[PDB]
A = this chain, B = another copy of it.
Amino acid sequence: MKINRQQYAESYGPTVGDQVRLADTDLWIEVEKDYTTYGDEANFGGGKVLREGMGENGTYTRTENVLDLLLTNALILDYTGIYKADIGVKDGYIVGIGKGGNPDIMDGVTPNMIVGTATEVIAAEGKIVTAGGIDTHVHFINPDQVDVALANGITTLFGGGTGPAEGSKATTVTPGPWNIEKMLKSTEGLPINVGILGKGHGSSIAPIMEQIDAGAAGLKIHEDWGATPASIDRSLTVADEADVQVAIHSDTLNEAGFLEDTLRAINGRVIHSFHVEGAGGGHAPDIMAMAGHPNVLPSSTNPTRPFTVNTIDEHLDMLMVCHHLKQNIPEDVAFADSRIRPETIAAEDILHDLGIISMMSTDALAMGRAGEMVLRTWQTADKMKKQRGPLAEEKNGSDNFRAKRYVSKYTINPAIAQGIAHEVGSIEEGKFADLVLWEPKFFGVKADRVIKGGIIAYAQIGDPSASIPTPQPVMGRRMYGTVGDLIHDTNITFMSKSSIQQGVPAKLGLKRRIGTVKNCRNIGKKDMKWNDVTTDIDINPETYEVKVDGEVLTCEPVKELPMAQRYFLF
């Protein structure tokens, strides 16, 4: 008995060699391998395989190799591969990637992926499954930002803020022990994973370190607090002792130093360089040269991503309104022209494509869009395919190499940068079950179901009064993982080792799972998955021309993007 490939893919999702278009882009992903045994595919429903004595085992208790949850027939898109498998979840973690069902009667069942009495089923046939997005540049300004993030497949928010206070509206900072404690308590009600950054500013160690001991997960150095050589130095001294990451928004004004002075203060220590292109902040005009250095973990924020015909007009004005700049004050116009540069925004597209910028992020509500990190990653990859062609590394006419390079930018690389990749950032055995299901037609645009800690937290679903869940209006809605005390078990508060050792969770009555930040001081650029290139980036101080090993990087903006007006009501 043989099934043609069209009929097979319609029933079980695609298999080895089949390709799938990402949304309305020109990007195609190809199934590299498949863990199934053809004829023993798991599926659930009337007369289907996962039934007692058949594909469901009726003998084993939950502890005996039985899953709490099986995602059947997933097309996984991850730094680790693009492939077809069943995903097994237990105790809120990914315990198996392979083939689920019943060893009684099926060949090839992964030994700890038994479907038993205890097992829930999610059908992933025809879906793309990714890790939850890790956004490491979040301003906590407006709690309504969390659903915006979940709707575009983000599951972890790292950043700072106390709400719409000016410090928070400019900087990813929750300053001092008391504001940190208050925002850890606020976090008990946010249905997403969270880590809080303290103020990376001071000339004495103790005012900075007491933020780490209070429960901060990292620090932010921002020019609006004084991105001075002293603040840089003390923050990295603290970070090296505490095993947490430091993010920097450098001295745009070059007031206390040029880029080389900031790099000298860093002194070869690891640092996460935010919005490395520099429209979002940093030494004018050459901050993007940071992305060539081995000790720099470089991210973009999203409004420059990718370079379009409206980008400069929107940014020049955005910068003018936010800094209350006057079009008739020459110093204000000179500042804006030094900061918003078509030359560096165009080159940023190519630096992403080359694996020289390792990460994406939002800059949510400060100069970036909470719900467009995943969206704009794929728009960038699509523009680069259109302008530069398939990468030389591709085969079979698939875009798998580019797709692994780009998915790494918002999944595994931020997680590694922050010291949280032991818990989150990829679909791997032993990691927390933060999973996003996508219909391919909506891939990167609107998530179908967002799983947090093994329970659905957010879903595109219809009329709650209907006979079935698909009638209109289909909209993003919070699901049972966000309700009551289940919000505690489905989400992680990431905290410093010292705050955990000092009992901060018990002191504050935190019920959320507690994640330990670790291993983020002995990493570098080489540790960024698929995005590990170190090189000399030259930015001409007169012309803002970008060169990589003496080669000029020019790019053109595009007038239209996929993943745009076909999808959005506004």
Contacts and interface: CB of A to CB of B under 8 A. Distances in A.
The 4 closest A-B pairs by CB, nearest first: A118-B176, A189-B484, A51-B226, A188-B484
A51 B203 CA distance: 11
B484 A186 contact: yes
Query: Of residues A59, A179, A230, which shows the largest number of chain B Cβ atoms within 10 Å of its Cβ?
Result: A179
Contacts of A176: 62, 66, 68, 116-120
A389 interface: no
A481 to B, nearest CB: 7
A392 interface: no
A488 interface: yes
B120 A230 contact: no
B164 A52 contact: no
B179 A120 contact: yes
Q: Is the interface of A mostly helix, strand, loop or mixed?
A: loop
Given A176-B116, A468-B367, A142 B59 contact: no
Given A175-B119, A189-B484, A225 B365 contact: no
B464 A365 contact: yes
A336 to B, nearest CB: 12
B60 A164 contact: no
Interface of A: 44-48, 50-54, 56, 58-62, 66, 68-69, 90-91, 116-123, 140-145, 147-148, 161-170, 175-179, 182-183, 185-190, 198-199, 201-204, 206-208, 210-211, 223-226, 228, 230-231, 234, 252-253, 255, 303, 318, 321-323, 363, 365-372, 449, 454-456, 459, 461, 464-470, 477-490, 508-509, 511
Q: How many of these chains are in the complex?
A: 2
A300 to B, nearest CB: 14
Nearest to A48: B224
Nearest to A303: B467
Nearest to A104: B203
Contacts of A122: 165-167
A80 to B, nearest CB: 25
Nearest to A139: B469
A44 B186 contact: no
B169 A46 contact: no
A198 B120 CA distance: 11
